[PDB]
Design an enzyme around this catalytic site. Sequence first.
Site, PDB file in Angstrom:
ATOM      1  NE  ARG A 136     -14.180   9.283  11.238  1.00  0.00           N
ATOM      2  CZ  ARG A 136     -13.768   8.459  10.285  1.00  0.00           C
ATOM      3  NH1 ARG A 136     -12.502   8.425   9.898  1.00  0.00           N
ATOM      4  NH2 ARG A 136     -14.648   7.647   9.704  1.00  0.00           N
ATOM      5  CB  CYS A 168       3.133 -10.924   9.716  1.00  0.00           C
ATOM      6  SG  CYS A 168       2.432 -10.719   8.059  1.00  0.00           S
ATOM      7  CB  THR A 169       6.391 -11.017   5.495  1.00  0.00           C
ATOM      8  OG1 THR A 169       5.023 -11.269   5.151  1.00  0.00           O
ATOM      9  CG2 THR A 169       7.291 -11.841   4.587  1.00  0.00           C
ATOM     10  CG  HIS A 177       0.835 -13.704   3.017  1.00  0.00           C
ATOM     11  ND1 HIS A 177      -0.402 -13.436   3.563  1.00  0.00           N
ATOM     12  CD2 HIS A 177       1.741 -13.057   3.791  1.00  0.00           C
ATOM     13  CE1 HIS A 177      -0.248 -12.681   4.638  1.00  0.00           C
ATOM     14  NE2 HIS A 177       1.041 -12.436   4.796  1.00  0.00           N
ATOM     15  CB  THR A 189      -5.228 -10.116   4.194  1.00  0.00           C
ATOM     16  OG1 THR A 189      -5.033  -9.270   3.052  1.00  0.00           O
ATOM     17  CG2 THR A 189      -3.944 -10.864   4.512  1.00  0.00           C
ATOM     18  CG  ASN A 190     -10.854  -9.266   6.072  1.00  0.00           C
ATOM     19  OD1 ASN A 190     -11.521 -10.036   5.367  1.00  0.00           O
ATOM     20  ND2 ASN A 190     -10.892  -9.296   7.394  1.00  0.00           N
ATOM     21  CB  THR A 247       6.153  -8.704   0.101  1.00  0.00           C
ATOM     22  OG1 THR A 247       6.454  -8.680   1.507  1.00  0.00           O
ATOM     23  CG2 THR A 247       7.263  -9.460  -0.612  1.00  0.00           C
ATOM     24  NE  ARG A 266      -1.127 -11.367   0.509  1.00  0.00           N
ATOM     25  CZ  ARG A 266      -1.806 -10.347   1.017  1.00  0.00           C
ATOM     26  NH1 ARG A 266      -3.130 -10.338   1.041  1.00  0.00           N
ATOM     27  NH2 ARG A 266      -1.141  -9.309   1.519  1.00  0.00           N
ATOM     28  CG  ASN A 269      -0.728 -14.626   8.049  1.00  0.00           C
ATOM     29  OD1 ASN A 269      -0.721 -15.829   7.786  1.00  0.00           O
ATOM     30  ND2 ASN A 269      -1.828 -13.885   7.983  1.00  0.00           N
ATOM     31  CE  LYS A 319      16.284   1.523  32.426  1.00  0.00           C
ATOM     32  NZ  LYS A 319      14.833   1.172  32.386  1.00  0.00           N
TER      33      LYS A 319
END
Lengths: 336, 336, 336, 336
Positions: D81, D155-156, D182, D185-186, D213, D236, D317, D336
């Site tokens: 962790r 991603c957006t 969109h 998502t989880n 967003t 969503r 996404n 550089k």
Amino acid sequence: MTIRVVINGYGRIGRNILRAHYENGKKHDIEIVAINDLGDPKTNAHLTRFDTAHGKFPGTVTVDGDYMVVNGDKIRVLANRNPAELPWGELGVDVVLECTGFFTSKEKAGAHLKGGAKKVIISAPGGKDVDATIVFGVNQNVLKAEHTVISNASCTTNCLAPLVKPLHDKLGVETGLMTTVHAYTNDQVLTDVYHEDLRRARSATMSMIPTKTGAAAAVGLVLPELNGKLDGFAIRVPTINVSLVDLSFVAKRDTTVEEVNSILQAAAEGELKDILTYNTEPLVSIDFNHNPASSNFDATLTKVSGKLVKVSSWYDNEWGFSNRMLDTTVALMSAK
Amino acid sequence: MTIRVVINGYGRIGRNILRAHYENGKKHDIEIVAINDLGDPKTNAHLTRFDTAHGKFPGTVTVDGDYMVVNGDKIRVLANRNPAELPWGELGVDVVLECTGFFTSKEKAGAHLKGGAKKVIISAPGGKDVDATIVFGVNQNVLKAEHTVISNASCTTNCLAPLVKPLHDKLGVETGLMTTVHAYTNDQVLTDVYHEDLRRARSATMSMIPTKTGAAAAVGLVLPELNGKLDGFAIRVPTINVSLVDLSFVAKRDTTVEEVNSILQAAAEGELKDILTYNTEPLVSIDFNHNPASSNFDATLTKVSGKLVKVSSWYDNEWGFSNRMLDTTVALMSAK
Amino acid sequence: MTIRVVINGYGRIGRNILRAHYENGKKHDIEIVAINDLGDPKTNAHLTRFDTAHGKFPGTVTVDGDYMVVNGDKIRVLANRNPAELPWGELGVDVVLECTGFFTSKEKAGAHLKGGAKKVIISAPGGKDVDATIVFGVNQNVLKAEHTVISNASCTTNCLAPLVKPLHDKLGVETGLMTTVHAYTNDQVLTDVYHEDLRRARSATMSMIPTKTGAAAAVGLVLPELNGKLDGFAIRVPTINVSLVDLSFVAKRDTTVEEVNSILQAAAEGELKDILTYNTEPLVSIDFNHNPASSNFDATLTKVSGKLVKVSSWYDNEWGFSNRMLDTTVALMSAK
Amino acid sequence: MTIRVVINGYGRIGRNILRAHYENGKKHDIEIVAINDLGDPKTNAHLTRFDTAHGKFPGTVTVDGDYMVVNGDKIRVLANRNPAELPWGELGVDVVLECTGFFTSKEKAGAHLKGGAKKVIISAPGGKDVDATIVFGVNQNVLKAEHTVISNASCTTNCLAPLVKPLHDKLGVETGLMTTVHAYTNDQVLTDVYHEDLRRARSATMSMIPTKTGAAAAVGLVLPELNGKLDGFAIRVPTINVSLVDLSFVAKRDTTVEEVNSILQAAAEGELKDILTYNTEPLVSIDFNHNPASSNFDATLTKVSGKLVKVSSWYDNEWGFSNRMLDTTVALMSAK
Ligand SMILES: [Mg+2]
Ligand SMILES: [Mg+2]
Ligand SMILES: [Mg+2]
Ligand SMILES: [Mg+2]
Ligand SMILES: [Mg+2]
Ligand SMILES: [Mg+2]
């Protein structure tokens, strides 16, 4: 007097008109005396009792001979693909609610007039020859007794027009473009199959699917001052009902999020009450399912960047429109 | 000695047959020389290139005049609703893959024979007058050179028969009942609308929907010893592809989970290789999508209580059947 | 004369218990005096007003200080992960409805007793040391005044036991295996992500997902004559609510489809009225959403092949169980 | 000359970065030498082999002791962790791909540097103290060798910036508002349950769900000329992957659909090749699944009314962002 109505086309639109009439306690002085549909009357009665999107009908529906009895009202059931052959004159029909999608011009919808009906309201955009195009709450005052075939516009136009009318009056709309994030419909498919439109040939349950719509451009039929100033398209997404109008427009003068919201709040509390609603709660699309309003403005989504303004409104694309068909029926028969 | 085949009806079944032939690298001595379909060839080519369930075709498809070119192969494109007028004899057609659903009897499918084709394989259960019903890997040995119109059974029967045959051979099946948990198909609807069947009239994306299945009774056509011993029904659920046979049967003697699994593993490694597979991994339905096997037995799901046995098998209800159509074409042309 | 109840865990189960209590007109002599949940009270009030599966609560919910006011009833809102620290004794709590899933043994649920509550009902299968496991309508007569920690079984067991008890009484069940085609739950995932179970780690919206369930094997706790005679598993499918018990069992004597249906019809009209319902209409799963019955037997699906019998029953896996939690509360406090 | 990288956090983002590296034939001079994750390595390997959205990994994955072997490459597997305790210095780590979401500031991400890593790339928007925020293809030229902790944006933002930069250069953007339609998502839920955000608390499978967003405002970090000129929100919808940027902006002058499309076609064929694509086919969202581009402009959807322009771009996404993480890794080590 009581308006005698018949529903031509007992598909989803026609069924939801009948259900809207009974679920508001027949608040309109309307009697539905007949429905015409090519389907088996027992099947259509079953689909009236049970619906996935709109739940169980809160009444009784039975089939008795040539009639469907809804809460004690005997409704004549017909099945004829040619409306000119229907016995409208014998039934004393005042208004035909034309919901098949096959008779959207004044010439074609005139078949109902040939059958003896006095007037026709098309549940869809009409041909250029229709006597009027109506978004109830916006321009029903243009109706006259001489009008015999009118269009009730589309579900999307009934959501957009109440949204844009107060904004144009108080702020001014130079030009605007719309996206409607829209539930899928039965013109789409479950898995890829032949279709006239190559995008709609693709599974509606798995993809966002762009499709054309004239609803934004049709606001010019209802608000002539905005002729040619609005356009847009739709994105079908995997939901069964309820859609979202997303309008971005250039205002004619400087404004703010708060002023934009105040204009629509006043309209929802005033001239457009019960047609346009004003929402500040953190809700999602299903919360507006079975909501009879034409346009549920979501003040939480309003954005302004310079002169560009973004306003969004939820609408039950089936229930709001079906309820408006009844409102427009009364206005048409009350026109002088 | 190449079999010249044509596809009558370029719907999902016909498209998946063509894609199966080219994706396994034309492993069969088969050439698709023509397709007959009333649809626009450009639309059918587009739906061959792109599919939601089965992804992108890993090849090239173009339309050049009267031909659809698949990986350089010119395939004649025809559009004639009457098979007797099709130029099968001029094209030297050996086998017509009948995939329209309109010619499922020997009497009707014989129109292809009048047109000059030698044989016909119906991509569905056939009428009682068909010369044979074939589940490849199980009973293709019954085919004879005199057979001219046969049925390839159904996708569900092609999963059930390889599952139950080895168990019947080693244990004996007294009686059985099955449920087919099945993906929705294009015979279903997105939102409630008229249908000949009151349950398929309901939204396929929101409900489990019971429906009849003839697979349990039709296994007797392929395995006569099991005639009348099996019954059941199907439940459509909101998935786009891949289905599950769930078979419960009483064995003629007591057994165990371990013996039941061992019997099917031996069959999958032997006589039924590449038709029946044996799976022990913790997989879900989508893992079997685009799997060309007829029956993917899931040994992890087996349950046994005395003589009562429960066995489950996943099957791609489109891809497995499409590949079996090619196998049966070769078997029919090799029959003596 | 009024049972003072608190809900420990205001997740979906706890919320649906509260909504069931108010949507049946608070027909039980029960007052919910507190809810314990680690979430913000404004958030939990919002989720009481609006639900996707069960629609809008037909009442009023507001937050006033440390209370959630439901139809004018002030309900204390607490947030403590350790139930033994909750002021049950000070609030005169009779029954704790334990709905967190973390206190399913009698020793762990005894934390509520240490806090001053008289009794606990676990909304899930209990440990082996719980005083009783109850399917209301089947075996609530086993409850005694001395019982202090009981289990209400599971939603699946509350569907299975009313289905199988009449059949065992009249026909006799030798052994049985069942599948429950089950809606997804919040233990599953939207897109593949880490999970203790590799099958539940897979997207629940796209696949059929097998999973273990002890409901069939545990039925012996409620019907001891069936101890060890039943087993099965579940197939999670992409629906948000409502599930189906699919039981195949060997009867001890010959029977028929009509006799099997007649047995369950008599039970639904008699001993199990309003707990078990009897259905003959062509319905689909969503038609049973928000149905408060424990088991909705579908007589249209019954199959018999020899001694093997297949019976199926729909159940709202949330709403039926939530309503039964209230019934069992009254039975427990009425036990002598 | 090879860049040694480790992945901190092997959730979906880390998994898709690894799969992107191997599924393009290790086209970058990068070797993944270790992954740190607290999950069971066998479970993480299984989810690497099988994914619902992105299918089966076209390679080999096994677990051998403390290493995961991907196409024969031994990848050290760690579980700590505290990143300061990780043996990055012992492993000669050049770049840590920080994908846990817990170390998004330069202050927090510096723990990897204390552990011996030379640099860190956060797979998300970074805190105000990060050395740079990069949309590869747009502003990677701002990177310097002295930068040690950077952000790869979101991603957006990686879809919006390539879309709007050429339009600003050739046409000019006065102001703009965007909606991103969109995929879920989880962070969302299957059925209504507690969430810190009251809209994400609602079922993602059944509703369109507005959410905040930062992409519109964050484009100002990569394109400073557009600072403060863009705003918007997200909706969503029930799809598992692939999203859509829908940008409406006021141009500095009147334009046409043809000019807008021509500007983006030149960019896709020139400086932004392989980052921005130009599409003219009638496609739907799933056709862009597993597409590695940052921004797939859809020329078929463009609308113009005077100065008001609406442009739309599809983006995977997950997959586009994952491939960009590899591109930005090489640019950072080449700076550089
Ligand atoms: Mg007048
Ligand atoms: Mg001829
Ligand atoms: Mg009382
Ligand atoms: Mg205390
Ligand atoms: Mg006693
Ligand atoms: Mg160190």
